[PDB]
Amino acid sequence: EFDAIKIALASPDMIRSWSFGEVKKPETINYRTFKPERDGLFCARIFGPVKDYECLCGKYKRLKHRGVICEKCGVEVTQTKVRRERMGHIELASPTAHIWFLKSLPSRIGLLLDMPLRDIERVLYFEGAEAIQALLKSMDLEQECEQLREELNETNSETKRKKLTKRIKLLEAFVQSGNKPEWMILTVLPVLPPDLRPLVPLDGGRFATSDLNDLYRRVINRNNRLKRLLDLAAPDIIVRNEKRMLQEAVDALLDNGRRGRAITGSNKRPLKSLADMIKGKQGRFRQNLLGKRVDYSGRSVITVGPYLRLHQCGLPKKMALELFKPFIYGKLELRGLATTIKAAKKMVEREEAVVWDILDEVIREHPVLLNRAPTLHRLGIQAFEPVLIEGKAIQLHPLVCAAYNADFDGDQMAVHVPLTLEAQLEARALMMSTNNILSPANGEPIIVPSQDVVLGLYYMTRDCVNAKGEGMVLTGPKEAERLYRSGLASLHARVKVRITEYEKDANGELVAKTSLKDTTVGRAILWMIVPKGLPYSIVNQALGKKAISKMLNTCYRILGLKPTVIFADQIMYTGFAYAARSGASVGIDDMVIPEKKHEIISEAEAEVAEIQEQFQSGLVTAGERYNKVIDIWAAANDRVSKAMMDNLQTETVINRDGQEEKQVSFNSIYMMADSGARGSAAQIRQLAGMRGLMAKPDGSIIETPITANFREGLNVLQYFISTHGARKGLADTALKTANSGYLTRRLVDVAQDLVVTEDDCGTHEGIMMTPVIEGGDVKEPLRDRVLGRVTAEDVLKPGTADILVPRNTLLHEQWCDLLEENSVDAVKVRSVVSCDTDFGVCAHCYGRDLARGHIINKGEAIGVIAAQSIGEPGTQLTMGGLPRVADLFEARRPAPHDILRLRGVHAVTRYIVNEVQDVYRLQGVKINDKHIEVIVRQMLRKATIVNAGSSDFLEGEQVEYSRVKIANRELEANGKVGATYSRDLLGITKASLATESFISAASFQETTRVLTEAAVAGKRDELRGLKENVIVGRLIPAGTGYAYHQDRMRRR
């Protein structure tokens, strides 16, 4: 029933129109009895009945006489809800100024006037503001603007022009807005409604009180003290001082603490004013409108369930019986088991057997949502089908843990229930766990087995020498299974088996081939779960973590989605089954210490001694033996580590048949490290080698290393030394989460409104792509950077008049292989930064969707995806570096500005992308360059005008790029001369605050100044972004709501 929100300055007549009651002289509610006293802050007459349909005197109590005010007492009969709707006013006796328009760095109550802030304050402080009021009343704006316009041309100094333009702009805006002068000084005061500032009873007789009711009473009494003094005609000496006491009192109800000496109450803490109820983490915007508390929700601890399918979860029945109450009530009413709501409620409370079948049928095909609190990317919320269990904990699928960052050492989780058909269908179609298998940040799978599954599959596919059953010839995998389960053969025996496999013939038709193959028993047993269409060579080896991931990706590429989930579940079942049968364990004798260690250290201790002799007689600099000793110790540590690994990797020696041979060993620690299940090489170094060299808290290297490992323990000194690094790591982890969170919030705020709105914009510009080569080693090839982009122009072959690549083609895996067969050159691209679309981007300038594989669809919120994709690895790194990227994205001056001014958008694009990827790649994090380009495009959305041309302009006139482009396009067909403009570059924090919408800018931060500018300019909000519709409670213009909004513009 509305389409826009309008903001402007208020007037005394409007304030009196808002009111229901006159000037409130009384101070107090009424402490003695419940009935409030009249004419005060709380009042039955002004704000309506205290109780529904009953007057204060009690003469009327019931409906049919409603709408008739009582005669004896004069009380209207209405529902009590009106007590949180109506307002009132206080009519003052002396005028007072408004602190917001005065207190600021660009003070705007004295910006129109030429008086400085100090002089204006001194006049206002009287060491009541009739001078200011009359000065603003008498001023004529039109003549001042006419004089200033002529004065601007005459001035030849750049410094003088800066202030003149600022004054002229403010004068013109104040004239065009419609707000009259002399309104920044108040003469009437509005009063907030009663039920939004209530008094809460306590266990004792006393009532808790709000800060606002104290400041209001203080203002009322200080203003009413002047009322009686006027009749008495007191000397002006007393009159002046009280006036100032009024000023500060008003400056208490408004923003407090902006002028020093903040008022306090019973305790030693400042009181919170009206300005404190709108800003900050505890204000309305960030605590009650962008987030809130909901119904139909629950919380519990999580445990692992190893028997579940990928689309299921385990839910306790005690929680479920209470989550789904209204559905149970409805179905109980349907079958006649109850005749009233109370009967159904009692029947559910005194639980019987009949209600459990009802609960079983209600949840048969109803999904639920599970969420873990930190919630870094969109995969932190998912949907599942619930299975009723016994107990109190929640059971979770082992394969979804890594995307949730969850482990079973005390984590908790929350659960929510959709209620409408649309919500259930959205949960099934968009958020189901079987839908999410590919990352949105890159093109890698998100489900991946680890730990016990990997170790089981690795052990299952290993190979030995002279094991039992070696040399047999088998009819197939079933014979291998039979022989192994009987006990006649080992899993590690080398045999010959007859295998049949299917392949794509020419059009997706499976064609079979049968042959004999040398393999092992375990590989043939595992072959029985592979889907039809894959080659046998993919399991005929030892299967590590990367091999299993490659298998899953190949199955997804060749055969699609439905076989992939079945394959994953079968792989998990097989891994869990075969890890238990091995009996893999860990013991103290698994950690083997090389025998030559006691030599390598000792000889090293000789060398360090020798240089000491060279220090007895002057032959080397005293600042040089440090480096030589450190190098000696590093070499010794390398020798010891190499000897340890050389002994550990081949520790098995085997008698084949009357002869000896070497083979890969079966030591538990070595297999755990090699398979990729748990444990890096450095940790094995620390366990069975040498602990190495430590560092001082400052950062220097302690000269003597730790020559012990964790098997043969440490002494007091080494253990004391090793605590500095641990404490420094823990402190670094504990204090740098907030930086990542703040950066993520800023990135989300700068790009929250970017949505795909078209298909092709028609532009022809773009970015040239070249491989990244620095120093001599190619850090980045010329293949992955152009995989999934769209060619801006035609690509020519390495010859005259030859076209190698068709235009507008979408490169996929087969196309990429065809290109790499004879790749000789590179391809240009179209970038979202160079897009002629107005208010959004077009699909072909974006590319493909990393989560799905095809072209991006209409209605995608790519800005939020980019922001999460960038912010997630920084936060996950916590629990150079982060300051470097925070300095780039804020456009900090050491320069990108000159890069843009000298080589176009390409210069800044390349600089920012390269300098961000350099930081992110050092930690081994993979993020596509699309998201950085999205953020950069958001970083440049303003233009500075120079030449007025035939269109309206104000010389400088920093304006929106899109609006200037639209004006130039409009003034082209008719025939005119356009304006001249230069492109600016802004930081994300500055770019967020300079937006056409003031609601979202106020939501971000710095509410007071944004609201001040909006009120003095008379701005209008059109509700076009995501945040505005979230705040008002409408469908967002993206996804399943997008078409809805497209209907709206079709209705006008």
Binding site: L9, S11, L192, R284, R293, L419, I1036
Partner: protein, 99 residues
């Protein structure tokens, strides 16, 4: 802990927030960001109106779920009205432009 319906705060008529008080879970800004990245508009609109400070919508929704009709008609949250009243209290005119 779990909840279906219960008591609401006095000014902003949103559910309370403690197990001792039989409160509901908090759906914060980051969860809103995740739902926006999914594109589930109707789920978000449910999360902001029918399970929250909208007063007539939740009553109608409960009656509809009892009757077997899974359909909602939302309205305007009360927190927006509170913010508008506070902005008016600060001496500033703010209005919903119906035209």
């Amino acid at each position: 802990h779990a909840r279906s319906t219960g008591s609401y705060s006095l000014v902003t008529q949103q559910p309370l927030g403690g197990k001792a008080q039989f409160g509901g879970q908090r759906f914060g800004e980051m969860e809103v960001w995740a739902l926006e990245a999914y594109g589930a508009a109707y789920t978000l609109q449910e999360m902001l109106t029918v399970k929250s400070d909208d007063v007539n919508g939740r009553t109608k929704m409960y009656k509809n779920i009892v009757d077997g009709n899974h359909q909602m008609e939302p309205g305007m949250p009360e927190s927006f009205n509170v913010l508008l009243k506070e902005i008016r209290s600060l001496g500033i005119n703010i209005e919903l432009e119906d035209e």
